[PDB]
Amino acid sequence: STGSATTTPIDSLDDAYITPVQIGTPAQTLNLDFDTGSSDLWVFSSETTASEVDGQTIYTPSKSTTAKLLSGATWSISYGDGSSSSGDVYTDTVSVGGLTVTGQAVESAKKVSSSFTEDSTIDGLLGLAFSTLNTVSPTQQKTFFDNAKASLDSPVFTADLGYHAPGTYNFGFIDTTAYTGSITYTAVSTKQGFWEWTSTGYAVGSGTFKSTSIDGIADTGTTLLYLPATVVSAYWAQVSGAKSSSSVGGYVFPCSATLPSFTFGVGSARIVIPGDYIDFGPISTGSSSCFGGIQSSAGIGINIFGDVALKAAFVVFNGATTPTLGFASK
Numbered sequence: 001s002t003g004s005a006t007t008t009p010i011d012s013l014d015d016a017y018i019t020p021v022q023i024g025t026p027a028q029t030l031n032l033d034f035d036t037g038s039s040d041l042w043v044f045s046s047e048t049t050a051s052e053v054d055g056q057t058i059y060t061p062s063k064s065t066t067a068k069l070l071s072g073a074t075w076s077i078s079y080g081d082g083s084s085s086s087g088d089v090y091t092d093t094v095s096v097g098g099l100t101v102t103g104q105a106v107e108s109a110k111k112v113s114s115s116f117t118e119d120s121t122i123d124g125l126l127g128l129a130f131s132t133l134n135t136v137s138p139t140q141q142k143t144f145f146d147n148a149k150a151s152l153d154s155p156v157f158t159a160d161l162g163y164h165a166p167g168t169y170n171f172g173f174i175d176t177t178a179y180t181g182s183i184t185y186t187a188v189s190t191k192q193g194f195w196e197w198t199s200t201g202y203a204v205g206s207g208t209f210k211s212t213s214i215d216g217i218a219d220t221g222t223t224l225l226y227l228p229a230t231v232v233s234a235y236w237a238q239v240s241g242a243k244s245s246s247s248v249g250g251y252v253f254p255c256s257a258t259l260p261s262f263t264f265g266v267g268s269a270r271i272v273i274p275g276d277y278i279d280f281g282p283i284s285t286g287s288s289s290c291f292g293g294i295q296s297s298a299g300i301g302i303n304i305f306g307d308v309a310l311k312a313a314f315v316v317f318n319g320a321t322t323p324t325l326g327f328a329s330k
Protein backbone atom coordinates (compact mmCIF):
# COMPACT_ATOMS: atom_id res chain seq x y z
CA SER A 1 0.00 0.00 0.00
CA THR A 2 0.88 3.68 -0.19
CA GLY A 3 -0.48 7.01 0.96
CA SER A 4 -0.03 10.59 -0.24
CA ALA A 5 -1.32 13.73 1.49
CA THR A 6 -0.84 17.43 0.94
CA THR A 7 0.64 19.39 3.83
CA THR A 8 -0.16 23.12 4.09
CA PRO A 9 1.56 25.93 6.04
CA ILE A 10 -0.58 27.22 8.90
CA ASP A 11 0.41 30.86 8.30
CA SER A 12 2.43 33.17 6.07
CA LEU A 13 5.69 32.36 7.89
CA ASP A 14 5.56 28.55 7.52
CA ASP A 15 5.51 28.27 11.32
CA ALA A 16 4.13 24.73 11.01
CA TYR A 17 2.36 22.52 8.48
CA ILE A 18 -0.98 20.74 8.79
CA THR A 19 -2.05 17.57 7.03
CA PRO A 20 -5.63 16.23 6.97
CA VAL A 21 -6.09 12.90 8.76
CA GLN A 22 -9.24 10.74 8.78
CA ILE A 23 -10.04 9.26 12.20
CA GLY A 24 -12.88 6.89 13.00
CA THR A 25 -16.01 5.63 11.28
CA PRO A 26 -17.60 7.63 9.75
CA ALA A 27 -14.42 9.61 9.20
CA GLN A 28 -13.68 12.64 11.34
CA THR A 29 -11.09 14.73 9.50
CA LEU A 30 -8.64 16.60 11.73
CA ASN A 31 -5.69 18.70 10.58
CA LEU A 32 -2.60 17.37 12.34
CA ASP A 33 0.97 18.57 12.64
CA PHE A 34 3.17 15.70 11.42
CA ASP A 35 6.17 15.71 13.76
CA THR A 36 9.26 13.60 13.07
CA GLY A 37 10.58 14.72 16.48
CA SER A 38 7.92 12.99 18.60
CA SER A 39 6.01 9.73 18.69
CA ASP A 40 2.45 10.38 19.94
CA LEU A 41 -0.63 10.82 17.78
CA TRP A 42 -2.80 13.05 19.95
CA VAL A 43 -5.89 15.09 19.18
CA PHE A 44 -8.17 17.73 20.56
CA SER A 45 -11.31 15.86 21.50
CA SER A 46 -14.72 15.88 23.11
CA GLU A 47 -12.80 15.17 26.34
CA THR A 48 -10.62 18.29 26.16
CA THR A 49 -11.29 20.83 28.93
CA ALA A 50 -13.73 23.21 27.26
CA SER A 51 -11.85 26.40 28.21
CA GLU A 52 -8.75 24.97 26.46
CA VAL A 53 -10.47 24.54 23.07
CA ASP A 54 -10.60 27.66 20.86
CA GLY A 55 -11.59 26.85 17.29
CA GLN A 56 -9.92 23.45 16.83
CA THR A 57 -11.78 20.57 15.26
CA ILE A 58 -12.27 17.83 17.84
CA TYR A 59 -12.36 14.04 17.68
CA THR A 60 -15.46 12.60 19.36
CA PRO A 61 -14.82 8.88 19.97
CA SER A 62 -18.44 8.25 20.98
CA LYS A 63 -19.48 9.08 17.38
CA SER A 64 -17.05 6.54 15.87
CA THR A 65 -18.29 2.97 15.56
CA THR A 66 -14.69 1.71 15.41
CA ALA A 67 -13.37 3.55 18.49
CA LYS A 68 -12.49 1.51 21.56
CA LEU A 69 -11.15 2.81 24.86
CA LEU A 70 -7.65 1.46 25.53
CA SER A 71 -8.44 0.60 29.11
CA GLY A 72 -6.11 2.06 31.72
CA ALA A 73 -3.90 3.86 29.23
CA THR A 74 -2.86 7.47 29.81
CA TRP A 75 -0.37 9.76 28.15
CA SER A 76 1.44 12.97 28.99
CA ILE A 77 3.98 14.76 26.84
CA SER A 78 6.18 17.84 27.16
CA TYR A 79 7.81 19.29 24.07
CA GLY A 80 11.09 21.13 23.68
CA ASP A 81 9.27 24.47 23.45
CA GLY A 82 7.71 24.03 26.90
CA SER A 83 4.25 23.09 25.63
CA SER A 84 2.45 19.99 26.87
CA SER A 85 -0.71 17.90 26.70
CA SER A 86 -2.14 14.79 28.35
CA GLY A 87 -5.16 12.52 28.42
CA ASP A 88 -6.45 9.00 27.78
CA VAL A 89 -6.32 6.71 24.75
CA TYR A 90 -8.62 5.09 22.20
CA THR A 91 -7.82 2.77 19.36
CA ASP A 92 -9.49 3.62 16.07
CA THR A 93 -9.04 3.51 12.32
CA VAL A 94 -6.74 6.25 11.02
CA SER A 95 -6.14 7.08 7.36
CA VAL A 96 -3.61 9.46 5.82
CA GLY A 97 -3.78 10.16 2.13
CA GLY A 98 -5.54 6.88 1.36
CA LEU A 99 -3.33 4.71 3.61
CA THR A 100 -5.36 3.11 6.40
CA VAL A 101 -4.21 1.71 9.75
CA THR A 102 -6.66 -0.15 11.96
CA GLY A 103 -6.16 -0.23 15.70
CA GLN A 104 -4.08 2.96 15.83
CA ALA A 105 -3.65 4.49 19.27
CA VAL A 106 -5.39 7.88 19.16
CA GLU A 107 -4.44 9.82 22.26
CA SER A 108 -7.36 12.02 23.31
CA ALA A 109 -6.35 15.21 25.08
CA LYS A 110 -7.99 16.04 28.38
CA LYS A 111 -5.61 18.97 28.92
CA VAL A 112 -3.48 21.04 26.56
CA SER A 113 -1.13 23.91 27.33
CA SER A 114 -1.91 27.46 26.27
CA SER A 115 0.19 27.45 23.09
CA PHE A 116 -1.98 24.65 21.68
CA THR A 117 -5.22 26.35 22.69
CA GLU A 118 -4.05 29.59 21.08
CA ASP A 119 -3.34 27.91 17.73
CA SER A 120 -6.74 27.23 16.22
CA THR A 121 -5.26 25.72 13.04
CA ILE A 122 -3.65 22.65 14.66
CA ASP A 123 -6.05 19.93 15.81
CA GLY A 124 -3.30 17.67 17.19
CA LEU A 125 0.03 16.03 16.39
CA LEU A 126 0.95 12.90 14.46
CA GLY A 127 4.32 11.69 15.69
CA LEU A 128 6.77 10.10 13.25
CA ALA A 129 9.86 9.59 15.41
CA PHE A 130 10.65 6.12 16.76
CA SER A 131 8.02 4.38 18.87
CA THR A 132 10.42 4.11 21.81
CA LEU A 133 9.53 7.77 22.55
CA ASN A 134 5.77 7.19 22.72
CA THR A 135 4.45 8.33 26.10
CA VAL A 136 1.46 6.00 26.56
CA SER A 137 1.55 4.21 29.91
CA PRO A 138 1.54 1.45 31.05
CA THR A 139 1.73 -0.04 27.54
CA GLN A 140 3.71 2.02 25.04
CA GLN A 141 2.01 2.39 21.66
CA LYS A 142 3.28 2.41 18.07
CA THR A 143 3.31 5.36 15.70
CA PHE A 144 1.14 5.46 12.61
CA PHE A 145 4.23 4.76 10.47
CA ASP A 146 5.28 1.79 12.60
CA ASN A 147 1.78 0.31 12.36
CA ALA A 148 1.62 0.89 8.59
CA LYS A 149 5.16 -0.21 7.78
CA ALA A 150 4.54 -3.89 7.06
CA SER A 151 1.74 -3.06 4.61
CA LEU A 152 3.70 -0.39 2.75
CA ASP A 153 5.26 -1.11 -0.63
CA SER A 154 8.54 0.12 0.87
CA PRO A 155 9.12 0.95 4.58
CA VAL A 156 9.62 4.67 4.02
CA PHE A 157 7.94 8.02 4.22
CA THR A 158 9.00 11.27 2.58
CA ALA A 159 8.66 14.91 3.58
CA ASP A 160 8.48 17.51 0.82
CA LEU A 161 7.66 20.74 2.66
CA GLY A 162 6.93 23.87 0.66
CA TYR A 163 8.32 27.37 1.06
CA HIS A 164 5.27 29.58 1.50
CA ALA A 165 3.37 26.87 -0.37
CA PRO A 166 1.80 23.44 0.14
CA GLY A 167 3.90 20.29 0.01
CA THR A 168 3.49 16.54 0.37
CA TYR A 169 3.93 13.66 2.79
CA ASN A 170 4.13 10.30 1.01
CA PHE A 171 4.09 6.86 2.65
CA GLY A 172 5.46 3.70 1.09
CA PHE A 173 7.08 5.07 -2.07
CA ILE A 174 9.62 7.60 -3.31
CA ASP A 175 8.25 10.00 -5.95
CA THR A 176 11.18 10.28 -8.34
CA THR A 177 9.55 13.31 -10.02
CA ALA A 178 9.61 15.32 -6.78
CA TYR A 179 13.34 16.10 -6.63
CA THR A 180 16.31 16.97 -8.83
CA GLY A 181 19.56 15.08 -9.08
CA SER A 182 20.10 12.11 -6.78
CA ILE A 183 19.34 11.33 -3.44
CA THR A 184 22.31 11.06 -1.01
CA TYR A 185 21.59 8.68 1.93
CA THR A 186 23.14 8.99 5.49
CA ALA A 187 23.23 6.63 8.53
CA VAL A 188 20.72 7.29 11.44
CA SER A 189 21.17 6.64 15.15
CA THR A 190 17.98 5.67 16.96
CA LYS A 191 19.63 5.71 20.40
CA GLN A 192 17.65 8.78 21.50
CA GLY A 193 14.48 7.84 19.61
CA PHE A 194 14.96 10.52 16.92
CA TRP A 195 15.92 10.59 13.25
CA GLU A 196 19.43 11.54 14.36
CA TRP A 197 22.21 11.93 11.80
CA THR A 198 25.54 13.71 11.27
CA SER A 199 25.88 16.55 8.80
CA THR A 200 29.32 16.84 7.20
CA GLY A 201 29.59 20.65 7.46
CA TYR A 202 28.31 24.00 6.31
CA ALA A 203 28.88 27.11 4.23
CA VAL A 204 27.58 30.65 4.65
CA GLY A 205 26.54 32.31 1.42
CA SER A 206 29.22 31.95 -1.25
CA GLY A 207 31.84 31.17 1.41
CA THR A 208 34.04 28.12 1.56
CA PHE A 209 32.56 24.93 2.91
CA LYS A 210 33.70 24.05 6.43
CA SER A 211 34.04 20.30 6.92
CA THR A 212 32.90 19.53 10.46
CA SER A 213 30.60 16.90 11.94
CA ILE A 214 27.27 18.27 13.21
CA ASP A 215 25.05 15.70 14.93
CA GLY A 216 21.39 16.64 14.91
CA ILE A 217 17.84 15.50 14.32
CA ALA A 218 15.51 15.83 11.34
CA ASP A 219 12.42 17.38 12.99
CA THR A 220 9.44 18.46 10.91
CA GLY A 221 7.74 19.67 14.08
CA THR A 222 10.34 22.37 14.79
CA THR A 223 10.11 25.58 12.76
CA LEU A 224 13.71 26.77 12.78
CA LEU A 225 17.25 25.48 12.29
CA TYR A 226 19.14 25.17 15.59
CA LEU A 227 22.90 24.73 15.28
CA PRO A 228 26.02 25.16 17.43
CA ALA A 229 26.80 28.69 18.54
CA THR A 230 30.02 28.81 16.49
CA VAL A 231 28.11 28.03 13.27
CA VAL A 232 25.27 30.43 14.02
CA SER A 233 27.68 33.26 14.89
CA ALA A 234 29.50 32.71 11.59
CA TYR A 235 26.21 32.97 9.71
CA TRP A 236 24.87 36.13 11.35
CA ALA A 237 28.26 37.87 11.14
CA GLN A 238 27.56 38.12 7.40
CA VAL A 239 24.37 40.17 7.99
CA SER A 240 24.99 43.84 8.77
CA GLY A 241 23.21 44.85 11.95
CA ALA A 242 22.35 41.31 13.06
CA LYS A 243 22.74 40.59 16.75
CA SER A 244 21.68 38.13 19.41
CA SER A 245 19.25 39.56 22.01
CA SER A 246 18.39 37.58 25.23
CA SER A 247 15.29 39.72 25.98
CA VAL A 248 13.87 38.92 22.44
CA GLY A 249 15.19 35.35 22.56
CA GLY A 250 17.68 34.88 19.73
CA TYR A 251 19.28 36.47 16.67
CA VAL A 252 17.37 39.49 15.22
CA PHE A 253 18.44 41.41 12.10
CA PRO A 254 17.17 44.44 10.15
CA CYS A 255 14.07 43.64 7.99
CA SER A 256 15.88 45.74 5.24
CA ALA A 257 18.69 43.16 4.97
CA THR A 258 19.13 40.62 2.21
CA LEU A 259 20.10 37.33 3.88
CA PRO A 260 22.81 34.99 2.60
CA SER A 261 22.07 31.37 1.90
CA PHE A 262 23.16 28.59 4.24
CA THR A 263 24.49 25.27 2.96
CA PHE A 264 24.60 22.04 4.96
CA GLY A 265 26.42 18.85 4.04
CA VAL A 266 24.88 15.41 3.61
CA GLY A 267 27.82 13.15 2.96
CA SER A 268 29.53 14.61 -0.08
CA ALA A 269 26.29 16.33 -1.16
CA ARG A 270 25.13 19.85 -0.32
CA ILE A 271 21.68 21.25 0.46
CA VAL A 272 21.34 25.01 -0.02
CA ILE A 273 18.85 26.93 2.11
CA PRO A 274 18.06 30.20 0.27
CA GLY A 275 18.46 33.37 2.32
CA ASP A 276 14.77 34.19 2.08
CA TYR A 277 13.93 30.94 3.93
CA ILE A 278 15.82 32.31 6.96
CA ASP A 279 13.61 35.42 7.32
CA PHE A 280 10.86 34.92 9.93
CA GLY A 281 9.75 38.51 9.56
CA PRO A 282 9.05 41.20 12.14
CA ILE A 283 9.43 40.22 15.87
CA SER A 284 6.11 42.11 16.47
CA THR A 285 3.72 43.72 14.09
CA GLY A 286 5.24 46.78 12.45
CA SER A 287 8.72 46.25 13.83
CA SER A 288 11.80 46.67 11.50
CA SER A 289 13.66 44.03 13.70
CA CYS A 290 13.24 40.61 11.82
CA PHE A 291 13.60 37.25 13.74
CA GLY A 292 16.25 34.88 12.26
CA GLY A 293 15.55 31.36 11.06
CA ILE A 294 18.93 30.01 12.18
CA GLN A 295 19.38 30.06 15.96
CA SER A 296 21.78 28.62 18.50
CA SER A 297 21.16 25.17 19.94
CA ALA A 298 23.43 25.88 22.91
CA GLY A 299 20.51 25.93 25.37
CA ILE A 300 18.67 22.95 23.86
CA GLY A 301 21.17 20.10 24.19
CA ILE A 302 20.73 18.91 20.60
CA ASN A 303 21.03 20.38 17.12
CA ILE A 304 17.73 20.46 15.23
CA PHE A 305 17.28 20.43 11.45
CA GLY A 306 13.77 21.88 11.56
CA ASP A 307 11.50 23.10 8.79
CA VAL A 308 13.89 25.89 7.66
CA ALA A 309 16.36 23.20 6.62
CA LEU A 310 14.01 20.40 5.64
CA LYS A 311 11.87 22.49 3.28
CA ALA A 312 14.97 23.12 1.16
CA ALA A 313 15.10 19.37 0.42
CA PHE A 314 13.17 16.29 -0.51
CA VAL A 315 13.70 14.14 2.59
CA VAL A 316 13.41 10.35 2.81
CA PHE A 317 12.78 8.78 6.22
CA ASN A 318 13.83 5.18 5.58
CA GLY A 319 12.41 2.90 8.26
CA ALA A 320 14.10 -0.28 7.09
CA THR A 321 15.68 -2.54 9.72
CA THR A 322 18.73 -0.26 9.55
CA PRO A 323 17.14 3.20 9.25
CA THR A 324 18.69 6.06 7.03
CA LEU A 325 17.82 9.46 6.00
CA GLY A 326 17.96 10.64 2.41
CA PHE A 327 18.24 14.23 1.16
CA ALA A 328 17.85 15.54 -2.38
CA SER A 329 17.66 19.03 -3.79
CA LYS A 330 14.40 20.01 -5.46
Ligand SMILES: CCN(CCC(=O)O)C(=O)c1cccs1
Nearest residue numbers: 183184185186187188267324325
Ligand atom coordinates in the same frame (compact mmCIF):
# COMPACT_ATOMS: atom_id res chain seq x y z
C1 LIG B 1 29.08 5.23 0.41
C2 LIG B 1 28.31 6.43 0.94
N1 LIG B 1 26.96 6.10 1.42
C3 LIG B 1 25.90 6.18 0.41
C4 LIG B 1 25.48 7.61 0.14
C5 LIG B 1 24.67 7.65 -1.12
O1 LIG B 1 23.44 7.50 -1.03
O2 LIG B 1 25.25 7.85 -2.16
C6 LIG B 1 26.84 5.80 2.71
O3 LIG B 1 27.81 5.80 3.45
C7 LIG B 1 25.56 5.46 3.36
C8 LIG B 1 24.37 5.59 2.97
C9 LIG B 1 23.42 5.17 3.90
C10 LIG B 1 23.98 4.69 5.00
S1 LIG B 1 25.64 4.79 4.93
